[PDB]
């Protein structure tokens, strides 16, 4: 139930919130909302046990 963002194209300004959910472009081919090579979701879920 807890998620953290690990991929972004820049660094945040102090006291800023960004809650957008778009597929990160880590390569050259566009993601177009579909996961694949060089295309990952920006938010990874925590694994608390």
């Amino acid at each position: 139930n807890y998620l953290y963002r690990l991929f972004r194209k820049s660094k945040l300004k102090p006291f800023e919130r960004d809650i957008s959910t778009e597929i990160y472009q880590a390569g050259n081919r566009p993601c177009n909302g579909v996961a694949g090579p060089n295309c990952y979701s920006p938010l990874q879920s925590y694994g608390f046990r």
Partner: peptide, 30 residues
Amino acid sequence: GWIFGTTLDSKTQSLLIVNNATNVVIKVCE
């Protein structure tokens, strides 16, 4: 009034300030 934002396509928070000569309405959501 004035609108503010990055892309303004219901993908990010967009600051909106509206004057109607009675109050000032400020909202953040897209």
